[PDB]
Amino acid sequence: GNPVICMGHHAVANGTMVKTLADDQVEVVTAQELVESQNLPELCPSPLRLVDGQTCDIINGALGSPGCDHLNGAEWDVFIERPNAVDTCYPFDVPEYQSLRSILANNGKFEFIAEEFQWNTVKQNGKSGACKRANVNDFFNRLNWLVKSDGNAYPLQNLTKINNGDYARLYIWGVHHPSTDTEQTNLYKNNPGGVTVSTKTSQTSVVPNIGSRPLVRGQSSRVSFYWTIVEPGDLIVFNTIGNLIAPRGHYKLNNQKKSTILNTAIPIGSCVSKCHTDKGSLSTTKPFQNISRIAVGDCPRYVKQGSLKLATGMRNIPELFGAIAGFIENGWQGLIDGWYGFRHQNAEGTGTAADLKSTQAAIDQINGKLNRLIEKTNDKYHQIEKEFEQVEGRIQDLEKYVEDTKIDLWSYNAELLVALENQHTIDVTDSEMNKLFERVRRQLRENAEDKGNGCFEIFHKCDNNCIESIRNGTYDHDIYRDEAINNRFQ
Numbered sequence: 001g002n003p004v005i006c007m008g009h010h011a012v013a014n015g016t017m018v019k020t021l022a023d024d025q026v027e028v029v030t031a032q033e034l035v036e037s038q039n040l041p042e043l044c045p046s047p048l049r050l051v052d053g054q055t056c057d058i059i060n061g062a063l064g065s066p067g068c069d070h071l072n073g074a075e076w077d078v079f080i081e082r083p084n085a086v087d088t089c090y091p092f093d094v095p096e097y098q099s100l101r102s103i104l105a106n107n108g109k110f111e112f113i114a115e116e117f118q119w120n121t122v123k124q125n126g127k128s129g130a131c132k133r134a135n136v137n138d139f140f141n142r143l144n145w146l147v148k149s150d151g152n153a154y155p156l157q158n159l160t161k162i163n164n165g166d167y168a169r170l171y172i173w174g175v176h177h178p179s180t181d182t183e184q185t186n187l188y189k190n191n192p193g194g195v196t197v198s199t200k201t202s203q204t205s206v207v208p209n210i211g212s213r214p215l216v217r218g219q220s221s222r223v224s225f226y227w228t229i230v231e232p233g234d235l236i237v238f239n240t241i242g243n244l245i246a247p248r249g250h251y252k253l254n255n256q257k258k259s260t261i262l263n264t265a266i267p268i269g270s271c272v273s274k275c276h277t278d279k280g281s282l283s284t285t286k287p288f289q290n291i292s293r294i295a296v297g298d299c300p301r302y303v304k305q306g307s308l309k310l311a312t313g314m315r316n317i318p319e320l321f322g323a324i325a326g327f328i329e330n331g332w333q334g335l336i337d338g339w340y341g342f343r344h345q346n347a348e349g350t351g352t353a354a355d356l357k358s359t360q361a362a363i364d365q366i367n368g369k370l371n372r373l374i375e376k377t378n379d380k381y382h383q384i385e386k387e388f389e390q391v392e393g394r395i396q397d398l399e400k401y402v403e404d405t406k407i408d409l410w411s412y413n414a415e416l417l418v419a420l421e422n423q424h425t426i427d428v429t430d431s432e433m434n435k436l437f438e439r440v441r442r443q444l445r446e447n448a449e450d451k452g453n454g455c456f457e458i459f460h461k462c463d464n465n466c467i468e469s470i471r472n473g474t475y476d477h478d479i480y481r482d483e484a485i486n487n488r489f490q
């Protein structure tokens with residue numbers, strides 16, 4: 001009525017606080033951070049193909065502005081566009097600028113092919129001192145500036161390019177418009193001008209506009225750029241009685257467009273990562289991140305919280321079933337080779353040993369319990385714009401509201417998931433502690449009594465081999481039962 005065997009669990013000097021459904025902060029032995037809050041100060045060129053626009057934004061690269069020659073033939077997963085990019089040619093605008101930029105970015109490549117346009121008597125290749133290439137008056141190398149004849153001759157242009165190809169074609173054309181009325185008549189003389197680009201099923205006609213506007217690049221004049229898409233079977237008719245900034249061919253479009261554009265000043269480095277934010281690339285296995293809503297590729301999901309700790313171990317009590325932090329007073333810092341174990345005392349001395357089965361059962365149910373849930377990847381490429389220079393009204397409100405709605409919902413999911421999992425992890429570890437206790441209780445039958453602190457008083461001599469027989473499940477209660485019963489009740 002003298003040896004004692006105690007069942008218990010590990011502990012460390014100082015653990016990590018986590019949140020559950022029932023508790024704001026409970027200390028557990030180990031935990032894992034789920035929110036990535038650190039970014040690399042560079043962008044990774046692998047495994048995704050990054051293309052640096054450098055001084056050239058993507059519109060100018062499609063126009064063929066000066067300094068945008070490297071973008072010729074370029075292929076990208078993510079077009080990297082610099083915020084300090086510069087206009088290096090004739091002052092222009094694009095109605096539906098955003099939509100053209102999106103189409104260009106998503107298509108993923110600059111692959112121009114040449115086509116010969118036989119312009120009547122009009123002269124071609126008009127240039128300007130605004131668009132100087134090596135201080136030589138030049139022009140958008142994808143565009144043809146059509147001017148009068150020498151002999152004062154603006155004739156009607158009607159030529160048609162037919163798409164009998166295997167792909168959809170992208171034509172970019174423009175409409176010049178001047179400053180007064182002499183303008184227009186010393187450059188196309190017909191006044192007003194006008195252009196009509198059309199397909200089999202679609203029209204587009206432009207009325208040039210003439211007036212004073214600021215001296216940008218030293219000109220009071222502008223060009224307005226449009227685009228037209230021609231799918232296999234359709235075609236495109238160029239009508240102008242003046243002012244048409246003709247195309248020199250068409251861009252080839254991919255059937256499936258899987259690319260996008262990232263606008264950032266961050267330099268391109270030599271790291272490896274499949275996730276890119278406008279603050280830099282992310283190198284992580286965490287499921288969430290608080291770095292930027294603007295994120296492309298194989299990225300963690302963006303959330304509002306700066307920290308969410310997932311418990312990966314039991315409650316930490318140094319020195320639901322009510323075992324851990326319950327009838328078991330505290331954990332054992334000395335138990336370093338297991339989560340649960342046995343501590344005994346008999347006539348020969350004392351000992352602490354780990355229990356493998358219970359330890360392994362807990363680890364199996366807790367280790368990486370998230371990988372089976374929050375999927376793996378989340379591969380997002382072309383999305384929507386998420387930050388804006390100036391308000392625009394209706395469309396911009398919706399774009400912002402959609403993203404704000406998405407973020408709140410995922411932040412909610414992240415919060416609930418962690419509290420839920422942690423609640424479950426704590427219950428599992430408490431559960432396994434008391435399964436171990438109950439296992440040993442059942443082994444001992446009538447030979448021992450529960451002392452109330454996770455310990456059994458064993459009512460017979462139990463030497464080291466006897467103790468080990470209890471720990472490894474070979475203890476035969478019938479051997480000691482006579483001795484034990486006599487000690488218990490007499």
Ligand SMILES: CC(=O)N[C@H]1[C@H]([C@H](O)[C@H](O)CO)O[C@@](O)(C(=O)O)C[C@@H]1O
Pocket residue numbers: 126127128129130137145147178187219221
């Ligand atoms: C095709 C053509 O006529 N190009 C000429 C332009 C246009 O007349 C204006 O840009 C129209 O506003 O004007 C220049 O003075 C310039 O800006 O360098 C000379 C140039 O040769």
Ligand SMILES: *[C@@H]1O[C@H](CO)[C@@H](O)[C@H](O)[C@H]1NC(C)=O
Pocket residue numbers: 037290291305306307
């Ligand atoms: C992201 O979280 C970290 C703390 O983990 C914090 O320092 C940082 O400011 C957060 N980023 C935000 C709030 O944009």
